[PDB]
């Protein structure tokens with residue numbers, strides 16, 4: 235089943251979020267900010283990892299939190315190391331790079347990768363609709379590539395992985411596509427329960443609706459909140475290989491590690507997403523965690539948690555050179 239601590243943690247979010255979504259498609263933003271569990275950045279290492287907050291684009295107030303083992307001016311490292319650009323989940327609406335669940339996950343990523351994590355505080359819906367979150371991810375990719383500190387190896391370049399869960403996995407994808415269109419090299423994408431959608435329901439959507447925290451009513455709400463006012467769930471932001479989609483054959487697209495919870499009602503879409511990437515000639519590794527609900531990567535309390543941290547470490551190591 236669901237471990238008790240997972241059930242209690244994810245239910246606390248579910249029940250809180252229930253009161254923040256308004257029927258008219260606006261959001262209780264001030265109360266949301268007040269109720270979120272967050273931590274500050276700290277230059278003093280906790281369990282060997284330090285963090286730093288930094289504004290990278292004044293025009294939109296765009297902030298990142300940088301994590302490293304324990305400066306942006308420093309020389310490129312001789313030996314390759316990964317830079318993971320991370321986009322938090324929260325369905326385009328919730329959470330922040332400072333949210334404790336994501337601060338914790340990024341710290342674990344540093345220990346795992348022996349690299350640097352850059353967690354992006356992208357602009358959120360409904361106040362900031364498509365394509366703002368994608369713009370912010372592109373901004374963060376270009377910024378990372380330009381810093382001497384982020385660069386490593388013989389060719390002195392940033393070895394970038396784009397990563398995110400939920401809405402953040404969606405963002406990682408669109409940023410990766412933009413990178414491939416502009417000939418910017420991304421070493422890999424790491425998607426955890428990447429958020430995709432469509433006008434029709436899939437089998438998994440109908441079967442799992444309401445059973446493990448997530449409801450179709452809330453998924454529909456979040457898509458409505460992020461997508462343009464005149465759009466529907468077949469908008470390509472939402473359904474990148476659907477009727478209005480675009481195939482990616484021929485692009486220098488990143489290799490992908492695609493992690494999917496079997497008890498996430500959108501699993502069908504995630505696997506069809508992976509299938510499409512393969513169909514287009516790109517390299518994909520899918521890790522299906524059959525017994526896992528949304529959020530499982532947030533608590534170190536299941537086999538799937540351990541399995542996935544290991545798959546992430548292997549993927550990083552395999553794609554660094």
Ligand SMILES: C=C1C[C@]23C[C@@]1(O)CC[C@H]2[C@@]12C=C[C@H](O)[C@@](C)(C(=O)O1)[C@H]2[C@@H]3C(=O)O
Pocket residue numbers: 244247248251323324325326329399400401447448449452528529530
């Ligand atoms: C309204 C929401 C938003 C959820 C799904 C849910 O239906 C209930 C649980 C939310 C959530 C809470 C915290 C994490 O940010 C998230 C990715 C998750 O695992 O669970 C969050 C997740 C998400 O953003 O996809």
